[PDB]
Amino acid sequence: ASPRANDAPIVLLHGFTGWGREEMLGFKYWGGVRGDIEQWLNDNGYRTYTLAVGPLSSNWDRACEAYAQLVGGTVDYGAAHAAKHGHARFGRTYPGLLPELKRGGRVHIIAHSQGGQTARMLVSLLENGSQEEREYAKAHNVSLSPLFEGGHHFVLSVTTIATPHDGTTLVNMVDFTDRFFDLQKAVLKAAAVASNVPYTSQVYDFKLDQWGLRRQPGESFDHYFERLKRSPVWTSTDTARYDLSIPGAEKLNQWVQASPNTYYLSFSTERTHRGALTGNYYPELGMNAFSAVVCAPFLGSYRNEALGIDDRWLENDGIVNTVSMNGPKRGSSDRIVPYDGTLKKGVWNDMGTYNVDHLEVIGVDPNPSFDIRAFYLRLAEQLASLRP
């Protein structure tokens, strides 16, 4: 029970590789083959909008982009941050999806996977701003984005679904494969090529503008090639891959903390079964093919006791370790409590673990057994029941 206590709008925030509504020919990240989640929510009286930030970027960059997309304006990554990592300070300019957040309004954020880290960071920056950005701005006499001031509280709630709050060991597998096939560098080169091809961005927009991957106006190929080789993007830790790794996720948890003015809900996922002999976990029949063959095996068998990666990390949903989903724990002081019928502020409300994989939970992969429609409508109702 507990009816409508607020009419604050909802924004959907995708995770790693996530694309916007106008990309992928309309195939929705939030809905996939099952439908259009944003539309189902809107048709039911829940004002909903969809955010589309850097699919391969760091949570910091994605948070800054999310902020601009919400209140409108030109993306400002921060002069200190831009200088530190070697990329442009300013980005794209947006009209604003919810400028009402600038004058009292509040918003519910529903995020999937990496989106969970971005949402938490946006809240932390809004609330505390960035001391480093403030000091840098005053010391060099440059402008400061309101986002780094602190004292803002327009986010009412953050709901994470299958979010790797403590990271995912999948990155560890990528580290091993790096000795040969370097996945990140390959993805970047592909993005570099695409940035120069005409219509590509209409299908999949990499949103890596800050790195200047495309050949500029009168730039010759020769100059272009030389400039790219010198780019710091190839060896940068200012990427989603780093924030998603075990050590990167902890560093994020060290400063991104749960705000006492915001409600936090987490949903965990698993689509595996434990081997009686080894203790290792294997993908159930149904998990999307990609995950089942390429990711699940490593996720369900990789251990590193010295780093704290024990048997409790083997259960997974094909992409992320389940134990990493209930809330930040590694390098975190956040509190996680089991949902007891009453949602609380400043803590993670563990809404439970669901038998659906990483892609099925957003409809990208089919699973007739999963009533995706009901899951999101039921979530919307709970968010609407929250007391401001």
Q: Is 360 in the site for Zn ion (CB under 5 A)?
A: no
Helix (H) or strand (E) holding 263: strand 263-269
Contact of 90 with 77, CB cutoff 8 Å? yes
Tokens 């947006």 identify what position?
94
Residues in 82-101 that interact with Zn ion by CB under 5 A:
85
With a CB cutoff of 8 Å and minimum separation 6, the contacts of 318 are: 271, 283, 287, 288, 290, 291, 292, 295, 296, 299, 357, 358, 359
Considering beta carbons, is residue 106 or 241 the nearer one to Zn ion?
A: 241
Taking alpha carbons only, the member of 149, 171, 158, 354 closest to residue 272 is 354
Active site annotation includes 369: no
Considering beta carbons, is residue 233 or 287 the nearer one to Ca ion?
A: 287
> Which does residue 317 bind out of Zn ion, Ca ion, none, counting CB within 5 to 8 angstroms by kind?
none
Active site annotation includes 2: no
Among candidate residues 112, 152, 165, 358, the one labeled active-site is: 358
> Which does residue 238 bind out of Ca ion, Zn ion, none, counting CB within 5 to 8 angstroms by kind?
Zn ion
Among candidate residues 58, 76, 108, 113, the one labeled active-site is: 113
Is 178 annotated as ligand-binding? Answer: no
Residue nearest to Ca ion (CB): 286
Is 87 annotated as ligand-binding? Answer: yes
What is the token pair recorded at 115?
């989106």
Helix (H/G/I), strand (E/B), else coil: 41: helix
Instruction: Name the residues that contact Ca ion, by CB under 5 A.
Output: 286, 365, 367
State CA 98 to chain mean position distance.
Answer: 20
> Which does residue 367 bind out of Ca ion, Zn ion, none, counting CB within 5 to 8 angstroms by kind?
Ca ion
Could you list the beta-strand ranges (E) of the chain: 10-13, 48-51, 73-76, 90-94, 107-112, 155-161, 263-269, 272-274, 281-283, 336-338, 348-354
The only residue of 238, 243, 360, 365 in contact with Zn ion, by rule CB under 5 A: 238
Is 166 annotated as ligand-binding? Answer: no
Q: Which amino acid is at 167?
A: G
Active site annotation includes 14: no
CB of 43 to Zn ion, least distance (A): 37
CB of 363 to Ca ion, least distance (A): 11
> Which does residue 61 bind out of Ca ion, Zn ion, none, counting CB within 5 to 8 angstroms by kind?
Zn ion
Is 286 annotated as ligand-binding? Answer: yes
CB of 110 to Ca ion, least distance (A): 22
CB of 57 to Zn ion, least distance (A): 7
From 78-86, 162-170, 268-276, 296-304, span contacting Zn ion (CB under 5 A):
78-86
Is 360 annotated as ligand-binding? Answer: yes
CB of 51 to Zn ion, least distance (A): 17
Considering beta carbons, is residue 343 or 364 the nearer one to Ca ion?
A: 364
Neighbours of 311 (CB within 10 A): 14
CA distance 108 to 48: 9
> Which does residue 76 bind out of Ca ion, Zn ion, none, counting CB within 5 to 8 angstroms by kind?
none
- 51 pairs with which residues across the strands? 13
Angle at 317 between CA 305 and CA 190, to 5 degrees: 95
With a CB cutoff of 8 Å and minimum separation 6, the contacts of 238 are: 57, 58, 60, 61, 85, 87
> Which does residue 286 bind out of Zn ion, Ca ion, none, counting CB within 5 to 8 angstroms by kind?
Ca ion
Residues 38-67, mask of contacts with Zn ion (x by CB under 5 A) = -----------------------x------
CB of 239 to Zn ion, least distance (A): 9
CA distance 15 to 10: 16
Is 99 annotated as ligand-binding? Answer: no
CA distance 307 to 168: 13
CB of 369 to Ca ion, least distance (A): 9
Q: From residue 341, give the alpha-carbon distance in Å to each of 15, 50, 315.
A: 28, 28, 26
Residues 144-183, mask of contacts with Zn ion (x by CB under 5 A) = ----------------------------------------
CA distance 244 to 163: 10
Q: From residue 19, give the alpha-carbon distance in Å to each of 24, 135, 190, 204, 372.
A: 7, 35, 17, 7, 20
Neighbours of 357 (CB within 10 A): 29
Which residues are catalytically annotated? Answer: 113, 317, 358
Residues near Zn ion (CB under 5 A) are 61, 85, 238
Binding-site positions read 61, 81, 87, 238, 286, 360, 365-366
Binding-site positions for Ca(2+) read 286, 360, 365-366
Binding-site positions for Zn(2+) read 61, 81, 87, 238
